[PDB]
Amino acid sequence: QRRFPDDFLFGTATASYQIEGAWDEDGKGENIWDYMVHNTPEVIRDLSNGDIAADSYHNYKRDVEMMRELGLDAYRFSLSWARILPTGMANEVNPAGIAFYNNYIDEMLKYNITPLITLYHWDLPQKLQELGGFANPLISDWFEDYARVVFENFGDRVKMFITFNEPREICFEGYGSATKAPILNATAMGAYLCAKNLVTAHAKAYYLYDREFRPVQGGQCGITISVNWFGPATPTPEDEMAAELRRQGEWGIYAHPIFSAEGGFPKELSDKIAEKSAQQGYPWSRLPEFTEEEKAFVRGTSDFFGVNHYTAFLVSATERKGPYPVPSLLDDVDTGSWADDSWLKSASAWLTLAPNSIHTALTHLNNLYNKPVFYITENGWSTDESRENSLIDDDRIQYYRASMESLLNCLDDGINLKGYMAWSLMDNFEWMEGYIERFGLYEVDFSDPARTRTPRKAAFVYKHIIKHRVVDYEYEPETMVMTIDEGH
Amino acid sequence: QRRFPDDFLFGTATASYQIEGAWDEDGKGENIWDYMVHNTPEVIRDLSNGDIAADSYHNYKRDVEMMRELGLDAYRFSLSWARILPTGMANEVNPAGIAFYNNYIDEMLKYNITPLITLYHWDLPQKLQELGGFANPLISDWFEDYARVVFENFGDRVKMFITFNEPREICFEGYGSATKAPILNATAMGAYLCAKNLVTAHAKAYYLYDREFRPVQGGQCGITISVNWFGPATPTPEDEMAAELRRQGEWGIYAHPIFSAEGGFPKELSDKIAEKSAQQGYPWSRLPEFTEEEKAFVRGTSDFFGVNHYTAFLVSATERKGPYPVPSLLDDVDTGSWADDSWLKSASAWLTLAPNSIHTALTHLNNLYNKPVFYITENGWSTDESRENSLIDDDRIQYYRASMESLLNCLDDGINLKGYMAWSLMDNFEWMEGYIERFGLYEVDFSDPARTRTPRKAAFVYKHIIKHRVVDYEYEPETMVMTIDEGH
Ligand SMILES: *[C@@H]1O[C@H](CO)[C@@H](O[C@@H]2O[C@H](CO)[C@@H](O)[C@H](O)[C@H]2NC(C)=O)[C@H](O)[C@H]1NC(C)=O
Ligand SMILES: *[C@@H]1O[C@H](CO)[C@@H](O[C@@H]2O[C@H](CO)[C@@H](O)[C@H](O)[C@H]2NC(C)=O)[C@H](O)[C@H]1NC(C)=O
Numbered sequence: 001q002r003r004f005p006d007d008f009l010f011g012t013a014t015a016s017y018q019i020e021g022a023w024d025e026d027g028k029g030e031n032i033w034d035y036m037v038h039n040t041p042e043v044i045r046d047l048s049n050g051d052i053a054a055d056s057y058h059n060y061k062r063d064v065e066m067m068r069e070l071g072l073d074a075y076r077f078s079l080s081w082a083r084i085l086p087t088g089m090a091n092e093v094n095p096a097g098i099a100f101y102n103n104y105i106d107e108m109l110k111y112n113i114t115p116l117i118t119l120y121h122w123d124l125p126q127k128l129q130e131l132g133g134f135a136n137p138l139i140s141d142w143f144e145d146y147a148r149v150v151f152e153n154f155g156d157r158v159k160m161f162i163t164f165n166e167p168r169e170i171c172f173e174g175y176g177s178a179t180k181a182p183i184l185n186a187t188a189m190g191a192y193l194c195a196k197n198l199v200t201a202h203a204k205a206y207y208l209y210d211r212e213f214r215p216v217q218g219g220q221c222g223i224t225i226s227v228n229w230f231g232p233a234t235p236t237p238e239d240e241m242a243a244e245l246r247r248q249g250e251w252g253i254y255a256h257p258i259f260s261a262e263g264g265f266p267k268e269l270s271d272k273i274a275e276k277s278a279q280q281g282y283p284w285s286r287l288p289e290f291t292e293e294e295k296a297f298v299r300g301t302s303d304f305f306g307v308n309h310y311t312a313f314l315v316s317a318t319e320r321k322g323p324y325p326v327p328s329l330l331d332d333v334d335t336g337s338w339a340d341d342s343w344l345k346s347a348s349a350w351l352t353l354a355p356n357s358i359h360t361a362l363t364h365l366n367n368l369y370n371k372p373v374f375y376i377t378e379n380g381w382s383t384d385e386s387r388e389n390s391l392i393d394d395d396r397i398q399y400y401r402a403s404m405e406s407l408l409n410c411l412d413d414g415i416n417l418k419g420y421m422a423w424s425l426m427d428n429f430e431w432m433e434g435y436i437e438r439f440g441l442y443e444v445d446f447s448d449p450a451r452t453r454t455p456r457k458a459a460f461v462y463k464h465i466i467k468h469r470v471v472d473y474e475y476e477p478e479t480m481v482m483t484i485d486e487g488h
Numbered sequence: 489q490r491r492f493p494d495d496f497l498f499g500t501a502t503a504s505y506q507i508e509g510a511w512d513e514d515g516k517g518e519n520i521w522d523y524m525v526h527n528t529p530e531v532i533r534d535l536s537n538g539d540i541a542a543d544s545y546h547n548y549k550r551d552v553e554m555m556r557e558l559g560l561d562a563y564r565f566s567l568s569w570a571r572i573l574p575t576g577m578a579n580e581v582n583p584a585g586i587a588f589y590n591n592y593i594d595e596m597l598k599y600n601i602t603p604l605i606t607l608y609h610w611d612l613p614q615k616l617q618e619l620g621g622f623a624n625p626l627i628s629d630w631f632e633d634y635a636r637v638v639f640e641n642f643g644d645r646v647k648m649f650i651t652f653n654e655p656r657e658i659c660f661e662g663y664g665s666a667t668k669a670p671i672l673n674a675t676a677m678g679a680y681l682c683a684k685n686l687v688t689a690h691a692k693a694y695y696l697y698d699r700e701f702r703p704v705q706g707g708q709c710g711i712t713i714s715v716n717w718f719g720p721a722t723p724t725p726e727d728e729m730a731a732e733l734r735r736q737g738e739w740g741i742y743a744h745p746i747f748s749a750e751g752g753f754p755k756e757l758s759d760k761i762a763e764k765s766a767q768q769g770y771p772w773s774r775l776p777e778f779t780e781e782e783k784a785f786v787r788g789t790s791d792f793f794g795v796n797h798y799t800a801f802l803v804s805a806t807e808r809k810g811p812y813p814v815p816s817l818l819d820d821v822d823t824g825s826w827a828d829d830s831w832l833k834s835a836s837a838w839l840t841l842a843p844n845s846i847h848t849a850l851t852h853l854n855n856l857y858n859k860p861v862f863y864i865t866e867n868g869w870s871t872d873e874s875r876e877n878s879l880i881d882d883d884r885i886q887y888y889r890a891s892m893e894s895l896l897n898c899l900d901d902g903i904n905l906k907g908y909m910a911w912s913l914m915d916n917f918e919w920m921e922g923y924i925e926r927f928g929l930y931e932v933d934f935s936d937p938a939r940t941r942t943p944r945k946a947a948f949v950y951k952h953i954i955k956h957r958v959v960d961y962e963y964e965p966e967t968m969v970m971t972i973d974e975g976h
Binding site for chain 1: 575577578579580615618619620621623624625626633672674676678681768769770771
């Protein structure tokens with residue numbers, strides 16, 4: 001039997017806007033999601049919002065009770081910048097926001113669950129957005145100041161910080177298009193400008209931690225990037241090339257500056273954007289090139305490579321290029337992309353069960369970026385909220401076991417992989433998709449004001465994998481009621 | 489009797505959004521006023537907008553005919569950034585946009601009227617505002633690119649450029665509160681952030697002009713700043729000190745970096761902000777102090793001091809302090825201000841006929857900033873739309889004649905004043921006041937599709953002053969019909 005080492009960290013992950021609720025309580029400022037869903041509710045598919053969500057603001061002791069039921073080693077959550085600094089700036093630190101996170105953290109440590117904190121998981125204060133947000137290079141400073149408040153208030157107890165979660169979803173989807181707040185839809189340059197400012201913010205936050213808190217606190221600071229596998233649709237030179245560009249456009253622009261030896265943006269995509277910008281009449285490249293000291297400043301600034309990974313894609317230089325805006329990043333990249341029709345489908349169009357996809361992605365990164373320290377910070381499966389017998393999720397179980405096998409392949413290739421976090425502990429507000437797509441190991445009842453969390457079959461399977469450290473394909477729980485085991 | 493020398497440039501001024509109309513014609517992009525008024529029309533007192541305005545886009549030939557009738561030496565108008573560059577960036581230069589400004593200009597020159605062009609008079613493309621506008625340091629570079637296009641296209645014929653009209657109205661009113669688009673109301677630091685970015689954009693446009701255009705074109709590049717006189721309410725050290733600080737807050741903040749010997753922001757106001765910011769718990773000052781390199785970059789970057797001046801105010805250290813937001817610019821300044829109640833009142837609350845105010849403001853500047861070249865780029869009087877017999881404007885006559893006397897006092901004092909531009913050639917969209925407050929020498933019928941222009945009595949008085957170069961207090965126009973005197 002292949003076995004997970006005892007020290008391998010199993011957890012789950014959530015994000016503040018998706019679970020907390022209490023959106024205008026105890027002095028919390030308005031964020032870009034609050035702003036969007038209140039002004040244009042129609043952008044959410046089921047017309048719902050995160051005003052209450054899973055109400056973790058009030059129900060955090062139950063959340064920890066659920067982590068214990070699972071036997072988790074660690075839990076990854078995010079901090080709401082506007083709950084902590086309602087104006088966005090560090091002149092006003094909200095003590096109710098700080099008390100809550102201290103309460104949640106302290107509850108975790110009481111039962112020996114390791115906290116992993118993400119500083120930014122998509123909920124910028126609306127007041128900062130008014131000033132340009134991630135399009136404004138001053139975001140580096142605002143973020144540095146926020147990171148100080150976070151490290152000094154929580155760093156005594158929390159030893160693993162993530163600056164940003166999924167830059168692509170921040171930059172491309174939020175600034176370069178209309179699929180995430182703040183739906184700026186600045187297709188020509190938004191994504192690239194955001195990219196540059198975000199990785200510079202990261203770097204500043206990193207040097208702060210390294211300079212002013214690491215010596216006393218002894219933790220680590222990193223970043224998480226979404227790295228799905230993108231491979232060539234046909235084993236052809238032109239599709240090998242298309243896939244390479246697609247990777248650079250999907251995650252290379254964010255990872256390269258931080259994790260490459262030389263720094264800056266990926267070279268191939270950079271030349272193609274430059275060519276495109278000139279043909280289009282811009283007196284410079286829509287992709288701002290790094291100066292040599294900017295490259296130096298940003299590279300080397302991560303203690304680990306956090307990887308959010310779900311799936312795989314086939315990429316074609318010619319086929320099935322859905323009409324993209326011009327100019328735009330996906331037009332710059334110039335490729336079509338899709339799932340193999342045989343791969344198991346979830347309730348989310350982009351999400352399929354691609355066999356061994358974690359191992360494929362990490363092997364590529366491990367060779368490309370000089371064998372860094374890896375954590376899988378998100379991986380999971382969506383099911384439709386309308387499903388009959390929604391607590392019985394054999395498809396989710398299938399997906400988790402396949403991810404586990406792929407994690408075990410990574411370990412027997414000597415990839416320095418230290419942990420896995422399932423997305424998500426419980427159902428939550430799934431951005432533009434609202435409550436239609438459910439990722440929880442625990443189901444939440446969003447009609448019920450107590451927001452009762454009930455374990456799905458897969459919660460028991462994950463519990464079983466964590467405890468036994470192997471995947472037993474014959475395991476099915478006899479009872480669907482959770483207990484906490486001894487020592488947890 | 490005193491006399492204006494023959495070389496004195498008499499003209500009038502207008503701004504693009506206030507007169508042009510054609511707000512979405514011929515590829516023109518959305519600007520911040522289009523956006524504000526179409527999304528929240530109620531912010532305009534009379535529920536008006538500039539969709540059509542005086543329709544100068546179509547009526548420009550009649551506009552020039554009106555300059556001829558007045559016998560103007562010169563005409564100051566603004567260029568619409570979004571009409572020229574619909575996306576805000578220099579990739580697409582809108583040909584119908586350029587053609588319109590080339591037609592307007594070539595018509596002025598055909599009848600020997602000198603064009604003075606303002607690059608920015610408050611109509612930022614909405615696409616650039618989405619990225620933060622003047623809150624975003626990258627505005628410097630966007631503006632420089634826009635300026636290149638302006639100097640390239642029009643500098644062969646236009647030898648006088650003004651970068652920005654009235655930085656206070658842009659920054660304080662627009663970003664620091666809710667009285668101008670884009671009504672961001674970022675009271676704590678919006679004004680100060682904008683201030684820094686605007687004087688930096690100015691300086692870049694200036695060095696661009698100086699290096700790449702001036703040697704061939706032989707023109708000048710300047711800025712216009714609103715400098716109303718602010719004097720002490722009582723002859724007291726406390727009210728002297730209050731008046732100085734108020735001057736620094738209203739205009740010094742914008743003028744000092746560009747026009748003083750040392751550069752940077754004014755010292756007294758800066759220490760005051762740093763003190764307030766410290767006791768408000770900010771980790772730095774809300775006024776970003778210039779580095780030594782920044783101070784040298786921005787200082788010395790104007791060929792003349794364009795002055796918008798209308799009136800004067802009395803200032804107290806203790807009395808009549810309106811309710812100011814905390815933090816804010818007026819709260820940092822911490823003064824009360826009001827017009828002397830004995831002065832003649834116009835249809836605008838802020839605007840009174842303060843006797844000899846031009847001379848008082850300019851004398852102060854002349855001594856403060858070492859004898860620069862001055863133009864009065866705006867000066868004028870407001871009357872109510874509803875006024876009975878709106879073509880008879882003896883109060884306007886009084887204002888203008890007092891202004892002429894004040895200019896002659898300046899010339900007699902040896903102040904290097906080169907010209908005067910009356911606001912405005914015609915009635916136009918008066919921002920938040922719509923068409924309620926009328927400033928025109930010519931009245932416009934805004935319910936008429938042809939937007940007929942008809943001269944007020946004041947048009948005949950101004951025409952007389954330009955012809956004979958003296959103020960005749962006994963002169964009263966014979967006719968209400970206007971003609972072009974030969975030689976014009
Ligand atoms: C976001 O911006 C894009 C690009 O400006 C818009 O997409 C286009 O709009 C027209 C009209 O709908 C389409 O026919 C074109 O295919 C697109 N234009 C270009 C230049 O590629 C899109 O509509 C905007 N989205 C939202 C939600 O406002
Ligand atoms: C712009 O911001 C100002 C300053 O915050 C707002 O003025 C006040 O509004 C709040 C309401 O929460 C009051 O409690 C304060 O007392 C007000 N300040 C003053 C000086 O009276 C104002 O509401 C905002 N303007 C908008 C949104 O148009």
